[PDB]
Amino acid sequence: ACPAYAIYVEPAENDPENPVSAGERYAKVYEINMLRCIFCGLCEEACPTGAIVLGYDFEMADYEYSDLVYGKEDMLVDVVGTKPQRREAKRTGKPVKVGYVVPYVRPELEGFKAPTEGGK
Amino acid sequence: REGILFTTLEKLVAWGRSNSLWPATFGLACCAIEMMASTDARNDLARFGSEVFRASPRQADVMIVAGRLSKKMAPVMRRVWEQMPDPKWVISMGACASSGGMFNNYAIVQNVDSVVPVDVYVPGCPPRPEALIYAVMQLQKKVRGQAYNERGERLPPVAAWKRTRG
Amino acid sequence: QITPPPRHLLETSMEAVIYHFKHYTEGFHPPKGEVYVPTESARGELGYYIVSDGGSMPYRVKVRAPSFVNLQSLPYACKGEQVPDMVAIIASLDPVMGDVDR
Amino acid sequence: MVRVKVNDRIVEVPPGTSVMDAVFHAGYDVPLFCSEKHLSPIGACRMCLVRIGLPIQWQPKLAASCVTAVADGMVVDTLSDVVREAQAGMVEFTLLNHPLDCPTCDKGGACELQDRTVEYGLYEKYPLELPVYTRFEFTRRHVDKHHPLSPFVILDRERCIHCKRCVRYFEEVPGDEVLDFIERGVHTFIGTMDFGLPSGFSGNITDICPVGALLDLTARFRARNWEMEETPTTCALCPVGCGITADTRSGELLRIRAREVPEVNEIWICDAGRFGHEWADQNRLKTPLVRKEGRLVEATWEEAFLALKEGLKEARGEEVGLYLAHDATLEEGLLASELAKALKTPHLDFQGRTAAPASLFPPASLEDLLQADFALVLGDPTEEAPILHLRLSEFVRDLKPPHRYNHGTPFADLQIKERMPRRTDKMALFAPYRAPLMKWAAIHEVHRPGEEREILLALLGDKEGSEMVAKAKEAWEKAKNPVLILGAGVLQDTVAAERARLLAERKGAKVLAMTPAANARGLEAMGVLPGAKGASWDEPGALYAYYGFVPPEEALKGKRFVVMHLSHLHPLAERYAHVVLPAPTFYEKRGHLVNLEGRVLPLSPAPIENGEAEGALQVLALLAEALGVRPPFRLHLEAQKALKARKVPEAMGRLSFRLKELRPKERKGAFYLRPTMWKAHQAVGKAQEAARAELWAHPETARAEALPEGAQVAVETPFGRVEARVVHREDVPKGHLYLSALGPAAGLRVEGRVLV
Amino acid sequence: ASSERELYEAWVELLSWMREYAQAKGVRFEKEADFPDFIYRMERPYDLPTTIMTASLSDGLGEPFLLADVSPRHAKLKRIGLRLPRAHIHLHAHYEPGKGLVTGKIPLTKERFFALADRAREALAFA
Amino acid sequence: MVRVGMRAAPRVSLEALKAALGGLKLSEAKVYLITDWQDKRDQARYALLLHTGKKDLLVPDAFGPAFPGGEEALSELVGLLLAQGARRFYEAVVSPGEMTALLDLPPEELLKRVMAIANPTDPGIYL
Amino acid sequence: MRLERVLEEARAKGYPIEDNGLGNLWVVLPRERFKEEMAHYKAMGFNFLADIVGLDYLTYPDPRPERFAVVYELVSLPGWKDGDGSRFFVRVYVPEEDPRLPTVTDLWGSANFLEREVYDLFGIVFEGHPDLRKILTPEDLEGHPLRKDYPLGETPTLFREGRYIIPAEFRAALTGKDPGLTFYKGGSRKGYRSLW
Ligand code: SF4
Ligand code: SF4
Ligand code: SF4
Ligand code: SF4
Ligand code: SF4
Ligand code: FES
Prior knowledge:
The structure is cut from a larger assembly and holds 7 protein chains of 7 kinds.
Chain B: H1 7-19, E1 23-27, H2 31-36, E2 39-40, E3 43-44, E4 62-66, H3 74-82, E5 89-93, H4 95-98, E6 120-122, H5 129-143
Parallel strand pairs in B: 1-4, 4-5, 5-6
Antiparallel strand pairs in B: 2-3
Helix pairs in contact in B: 1-5
Chain E: H1 4-25, E1 29-34, H2 36-39, E2 52-58, E3 64-70, E4 80-84, E5 89-96, E6 100-103, E7 106-107, H3 110-123
Chain G: H1 2-10, E1 17-19, E2 25-28, H2 31-43, E3 48-56, E4 68-75, E5 87-94, E6 100-102, H3 111-121, E7 125-127, H4 167-170
The complex binds iron/sulfur cluster (5 copies) and FE2/S2 (inorganic) cluster.
Enzyme class (chain B): translocase
Subcellular location (chain B): Cell membrane
Main location (chain B): membrane
């Protein structure tokens, strides 16, 4: 359903002993070219498990084309920040600071870490 | 002479070129309005040093490719890029410029790095104005010589120094 | 056929999965025919001449670009006006070249 | 012809036409689960229901248009509101118990159920009233999931909608009843006690199952059907060259499937052709190597051609060998022949060349086979020309070619009833063992190697054979238009092929020559055969040689320069070859080939990662320039022109060419090289143990030679050293050991010895 | 009512029982099928303790000899069902409070399940 | 349209291209440097399609640093085209599976495809 | 109102009238009668020329008379001197190897740019044009983009390690002639229309 064709999915079979997905199938390779991505929302609208869902960060400018293909482990909910942000946190020793604030995060973003209305 | 040959002097001139980025307006497409909104009275690219806006190419260093670079505009932009002073930087704004965007066809250059040396790439459609400020900050610390890629490499201050232009 | 299934019953019905999958991969196939509807844009009369061939993708989509036909009035309008006024007389027309070149 | 009306249209149609087929022929449509092309229709899915008027006199209840014949001037209504109501109802019944696995279903978009459902379901019931998809709110059917029935096939018993396609196929098309239901009612599920899937045509059900129950295990979890890059081409493993479709994505070969071309194969592929693709993309040579310091090192093309120039600077035209591979396109053979005209050398040949050329005989059309009277077979089609078996399943059941409608192959051919009897009298088979086809050919005598020629003599009538041979003689006489089918033993045994030619001329009858090489008849037609000296593809005669395969190890020894054009690297090459270069597989080449029926079939290139390879065309163009002789071919277009000039017809066009010359060679008979469907180089992944080598012996011969029922015995042949699992078999004659020849060395008899 | 929970809870226990048998006799146990209303829940809540709906005890050849299923979170007439393949043997277990898990009116004891599975191992499995 | 050179032979293809080129005036000719993998020019391979308008010239994937010493040949090549008056340089990006078959298509299909898909390129990136 | 009079004028002239149940009218004129008829159409008061849309019917599943079809859109402004509001279309087929059509420049100057676009997008040369200069596509571009035999010119999308996509071999959606991934397309996916 990607009208820009920026999503590539190499699949694989869950390992029952240490499964990764909820069914019998998971995404071994999930790479998205942010330079191709036009930010439609059709990926979210088609995802039947709510796995791929658009986030909020916009501070994603980087210098090299081949570095702007964000990978799975660069978009998992576990992570805090964008690629240049993480790289600056490494080469700087300074933690990640997000440059946005939102009134709240949607339910579809369960787990998505963000500044929420000032409760913290 | 190229802003080099003293450890303090190159830091100084790099500082100056970094914060004194004088944009050269090259609006192409719908990226252009979200570019201008980075100057409206909610969010202005008018603080870092980019208040004034010399449309002339003979007087501005940053060329913001804001929109799809159609092919009939490519050679013209070519000379426009060569009609910039040598201390010049080239940012590729939007998906259509950085990548082919969704317009994967006969009409559009699928990456503007083909014709012009790109300094900074910025995804988005349209890139939020604050993302454009983030891109110029990226370029800022690049021309200061404070920028590293995913492979660990420091990037040169001024892209378009490394091309045998002709 | 026209609207994808509601997101909540994806875990209840097979038919839900079938329609969701097909619609988001193939889409739907409208009948063979040509169509047009006009609207008023901030730049005048607009419309789409859409030719559908019974496939999941339209056969052709032509846009009646209001600024495209509207621009023909520039040599006439700015004829005899001043050189500076050639700018306002363009701005008075409100052109959007994403519309014109198209 | 008979008049039919579909809802607004009038169609002329031959009588035996199914109502469903005539409906499609009028351009209309109807869901379809029960019936299938070339399969015996039975109203089971009850999906094909239409309205029929037979005067306006509508039938009392809806007639099954898939299995209801047509009458002259019959009215058919497929658009009545009641019709679509019933079709949607049947679709809902069918979808009732599916497991909700579409997202993880590797059949993806190509699920007939999905498309017919999205077509006919949910009739607009009579506003913006809230629609409900499903009414059944109970618990669905759950059974065992993703059960591998075989190293090639996966079975998900839940998704099955209990059609009959797989069991009907297995009963009708191969004649191997290795799959059927277990229980009845709603609890019905598929099972077997024959687990290995013995039939060598098992894989085709993989395509037929309109659901994702039966899938191709080797392509499991690689991509969705629409994501795969589809390139239709032809499989050049064996000379029947079925039409195939190669699915590749991201530079590696994902899955191979059958492509319909009723001229040769209808919708079928053998298990070896369809599942034997793992070796294409797994490990292959991507850099040209050079032997410089007693070892092989990756080299530039410039340095490779420089070494070629220098090693062949004083290379004389009577010592250069030109030896091509058995899957060589017409273009390559034509270039090599033209070059040997220029480069005067008596020894050129190709890998699967027969001592007796197959070009001797008139090609037989398989549809002419269906119209044929009798089939006199010597050799085992299942191994030599596999899909013939399936074509034979059409022949022996008295089936005959359908009428060709506007939509091609008919959906429901009434000519095919279920559980059709297979005749024992319509063909006569003679094989060195009890051939699996001996089920349907009662006339059978198990002979031994080097006995064929005598059977052919006896059938000719000059001497008296066994009872079976005299019966085959008689039936051949009574046959008005029989077809003669020759195996690999005869085609490599000069005199037997001569006698077969005599029989098939004296009685007007076509011939099917099961060449061990695929494009052999094209190379012969394009002129690839040795001359006076005669160093053939197995003979170590030449002093400089070009090799496109693995020759006998003794063939290399003695030569001054040897150049091999391979795709993978063989130890025979890193120890005997001077220059090795990458060669693309048949999957990734482009050209035409010649079937064993004279029909040329295209190879389109596959988008597989071949590396830095260059086609054998370019290799020979590069090799002749080092010799002074300017090659005439480098590109494909000039090859097409020179082909058409050489009088080879268009694709699918049959090429008429006969040949009169025999080059016989003694056969040192101690071991037999059994013709094998599986090819040696396919032993990768799931074909590792399936395409294993075998050594078959009579139990008495086993006990005498001390060969246990399960030992992995290594054996030495001029063709290399191969170890093989041992099989005891009661039909192999005493004193003989049938070694499974997993290469295109079929039908050959060679010496050898058993290592410990 | 809410007994569903304990049912699913007891369902887990059944699976527990199953696993024990597999570990004793050295037979492969395989997680056959998980809950759809748990895979396809995107933002929706999921209250069930486990994600697994159908499982089986398979022989060496992969053909199961004992199959077990439980009704989903949203289906009507919630139950647990048991089946012997090839044997036309079907059981309908409920859970009655206070008494326990019942085959009709007969409580389902762990040892009963063990005897059924052992009979299955001896009889149906090919290898 | 002619085809000169061979795959992966930068020097042979280059010298043959010098000889066959001669004093051809390229004032309105078009040069298409077809390659794969838009970004990574560090290991890129390049083929050339020269459309003069009156006759065309093909050189397969034999230029670029992906071949040993291919960049020096490509440098001489672009300098040569620039000397003869070329102004319009183009790069077409095709899939590796395309590049090889593309040189076997009829002149009309190959030439139409390439002229349709071309991206204007700054020749400076190849010097 | 003048539309009804166009109907009563043309129907007697043997011009077929194509209509879908949506409220849009097509009047097919042959090549010759086209020019004088539409001169009369302006004389009938058809001030406003909205669209000139070019069509390539090559890849249409059912065949058509000719490959190219050019459609003009004639309207009458409701708020001017005599405002009816009649808007309708005139279709004229144009041969593949004879892309001739006289211009309506003499009647409307609006077709100045519009027709040029069709000469850009299609091989149609409009006779009687003031200046047929290529409008949209680059000057050095060879051919006419919108005709189906002209490639769209797609370029693959790129990823990390050799993994790519060629969209035209990637697209799952089916056009009219693509039978689909099953043996065929029937039912809803051979055309679907709800009944209000
Ligand atoms: S928003 Fe989603 S569907 Fe759209 S371009 Fe991005 S990844 Fe593709
Ligand atoms: S990236 Fe989006 S906003 Fe920018 S030019 Fe392209 S379509 Fe317009
Ligand atoms: S397994 Fe597939 S082909 Fe066989 S009966 Fe079931 S649905 Fe039909
Ligand atoms: S077999 Fe068909 S209906 Fe069933 S899960 Fe697969 S695609 Fe869906
Ligand atoms: S029968 Fe022969 S040509 Fe057909 S798929 Fe098998 S090996 Fe290939
Ligand atoms: S019942 Fe299966 S189609 Fe006739």
